[PDB]
Amino acid sequence: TQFGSTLQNIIERQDAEALNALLQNQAAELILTNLSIQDKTIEELDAE
Amino acid sequence: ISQSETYRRRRQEWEIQRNNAEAELKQIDAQLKSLAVRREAAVLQKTS
């Protein structure tokens, strides 16, 4: 039963880590999109 | 001579006014361009 609860904690952590990895990966995707937006924002000011 | 000059002066006013309209036609066009850029940025926002 102790190996059991130990394994259970390992699994829950294994998944929690996968989640943080997923979230940081996603954050990068949004930053890149936002950079394209800022570039267009500058072009707009140049057009002004 | 006075009447001939009268016509020249009248024309000069028209010249200034067509030039005013002409300038507006270039500024407005530039405004359409900065608007087009803005629209593209707005599209990128849809993308994000």
State both tokens at B35. 């608007």
- Do the beta carbons of residue A33 and residue B44 sit within 8 Å? yes
**Is B44 an 8 Å CB contact of chain A?**
yes
C-beta atoms of A37 and B48 within 8 A: yes
Q: To one decimal place, what's the resolution in Å?
A: 3.4
Using a CB-CB cut-off of 8 Å, the residues of chain A touching B47 are 33
Shortest CB distance from B47 goes to which of A33, A44, A48?
A: A33
> Residue B33: how many CB atoms within 10 A of its CB?
14
What method was applied to determine this entry? cryo-EM
State both tokens at A31. 């930053």
End-to-end CA, chain B: 71
**Helix residue ranges per DSSP H, chain B:** 2-47
- Closest CA relative to residue A35, chosen from B23, B13, B41, B27: B41
For residues A30 and A47, what is the distance between their CA atoms, to the nearest angstrom? 26
